[PDB]
With several copies, the nearest count.
Chain A
């Protein structure tokens, strides 16, 4: 083995001196044994004189100059494969669920190159989530980046768990959930709610592997935890040929941890204080999330917007990579419509006739037009009553309300908390149902026959039962 010695401890930054020509390459992981276990330093610079400057993944308090350091010979290596499913993992790849070691056969570096240009997919395509509103009005990109907007009280967690369930059932792909710099309390709540829902199942098979770097972690760990999660997902892509999900909550704190790390290394901060490496630091994460010949990794990224400023460099840089957006809104929740996805703020680059086909594009465009016209009429409808508008306006208002109710869906995960059986609706039937609704084939049906149902077949069944 190769061993150096600590020579400077400044905050989370540690300098290590090695004997001649023994130097570890940048991004290599160096291990120091302490009473609290291993402390991992990631090499960031070569300072000459056989000295390297490194970022500490854990608290440096208690380090002494001359403390010997062992080079692991490669970047931070984390376990991969199905043995990670249902486990909670920290940035350095150690379990933090106290269920014992992660007995995976393989371990993979968290730093790796994106697929070459020749390996990219030549064509964009849809990943059906089994959720009517998402697959119709904001279709997800297979191997793309989807920005998720919302907060507390809008069902974000149950929506995420429904994505995890639906992708697993429909496509067989597992999921990886990464908590980048978010509250420890919310991570515990997610773990508990996932055990209740059954996406985590300690006695049997489970659908999601969890990686957490909480707010209390040093800046370096909050930076690298996203790459740890991404690295777990990339294994399910490359070696098992799956269409994996990679949830990242929150990407803004990936950016913020990168900013803090850049500041600690003494680099001159860029505009409005962010790291000078902002764009390429984001790219190194985002460009690994892509479709390849064997599979794909589709990323759902909860994105915070500081000061509600969509022009701020952090959200501005993040939106360059997003192929679609899903906007959970409390307003829609107050209408009693779940998953509460805003039908009009949610947008997708792929909602284009050449990608989804002209039929799907036509249906989605007409649904958007109907909802938009109804939204424009709403105030005068309230003031004058629905009957005061023209016959065509009244028709479109009724159809808009029926469509809006029809966009609700009972989730298989929420069934635990509500008893209502869940529904997974594939895209062809969704398009057929909304097409038939737009053509007035079911205009005689009462509104709440469309509420919390699957495809149009369930609409017919529920209308029959309500007529009986």
Chain B
């Protein structure tokens, strides 16, 4: 009985872990997009400053 309960509990625990991992993936995907845009903008500003003198 303890074995059956433990296997079911581990199943549910890994389900919860997968939910949480998906949520974290969404958060850091948003953060990655923001950082990508920021990097492009800052490097382009540097290039423009070098060009405009």
The residues of A with any CB-CB pair to B shorter than 8 Å are 266, 268-269, 271-273, 307, 309, 311-312
- Set of chain A residues within 8 Å of B36, measured between Cβ atoms: 307, 309
Q: Are A309 and B33 closer than 8 Å at their CB atoms?
A: yes
- B50 CB contacts on chain A under 8 angstroms: 268-269
**Extra pairs beyond A269-B46, A272-B37 (8, CB < 8 Å):** A268-B48, A271-B41, A271-B47, A272-B40, A272-B43, A273-B46, A311-B34, A311-B37
Q: What's the nearest-Cβ distance from chain B to residue A130, in Å?
A: 37
Tell me if A271 and B51 are in contact (CB < 8 A).
no
| Contacts between the two chains (Cβ within 8 Å), count | 35
**Measured between C-beta atoms, what is the minimum distance from A223 to chain B in Å?**
20
Contact with A along B26-43 (1 / 0, CB 8 A): 000010011011001101
Q: Please, could you name 21 A-B residue pairs with CB atoms under 8 Å apart, sorted by A?
A: A266-B53, A268-B47, A268-B48, A268-B50, A269-B46, A269-B47, A271-B47, A272-B37, A272-B40, A272-B41, A272-B43, A272-B44, A273-B40, A273-B41, A273-B46, A307-B36, A309-B37, A311-B30, A311-B33, A311-B34, A311-B37
CB distance from A106 to the nearest CB of B (A): 43
A311 to B36, CA, bound (A): 11
> In the docked arrangement, what's the CA distance between A35 and B50, Å?
37
Measured between C-beta atoms, what is the minimum distance from A448 to chain B in Å?
A: 34
Contact between B37 and A269 (Cβ–Cβ < 8 Å)? no
- Residues A312 and B48 in contact, CB atoms below 8 Å apart: no
Chain A's closest residue to B39 (CB) is: A272
Contacts of A272 in B (CB 8 A): 37, 40-41, 43-44
Contacts of B53 in A (CB 8 A): 266
Contact partner, A269, options B33, B34, B48, Cβ 8 Å:
B48
* Interface footprint category on B: 10 to 19
A167 to B9, CA, bound (A): 57
> Is A268 within 8 A of B33, CB to CB?
no
Report B1-53 residues with CB < 8 Å from chain A CB: 30, 33-34, 36-37, 40-41, 43-44, 46-48, 50-53
The distance in angstroms between the C-alpha atoms of A268 and B45, with both chains bound, is 9
**In the complex, how many angstroms separate the beta carbon of B9 from the nearest chain A beta carbon?**
17
The residues of A that contact B51 with a CB separation of less than 8 Å are 268
**Residues of B close to A268: CB separation below 8 A:** 47-48, 50-52
Question: What is the chain B residue whose CB lies nearest that of A313?
Answer: B37
A271–B47 alpha-carbon span in the complex (Å): 8
A312→B37 contact, CB < 8 A: yes
- Pair B48/A271 contact, Cβ less than 8 Å: no
B43, B47, B52: most-surrounded residue (chain A CB, <10 A): B47
Q: Which residue of B lies closest to A267 (CB)?
A: B50
For A269, list chain B residues within 8 Å (CB): 44, 46-48, 50
- Residues from chain B with a CB closer than 8 A to the CB of A311 are 30, 33-34, 37
C-alpha gap A269/B48 in the complex (Å): 8
Q: How far is the CB of B51 from chain A (nearest CB, A)?
A: 5
**With A and B bound together, what is the CA distance between A432 and B3 in angstroms?**
49
Q: A307 near B44 (CB under 8 angstroms)?
A: no
Select from chain A the residue with minimum beta-carbon distance to B37: A272
B33 near A307: Cβ-Cβ < 8 Å: yes
Kindly list the 3 A-B residue pairs having the minimum CB-CB distance in the complex, ordered from nearest: A269-B50, A309-B33, A272-B40
CB proximity of A100 to chain B, nearest CB, Å: 46
CB distance from B30 to the nearest CB of A (A): 8
A178 to chain B, nearest CB (A): 29
A307 to B40, CA, bound (A): 13
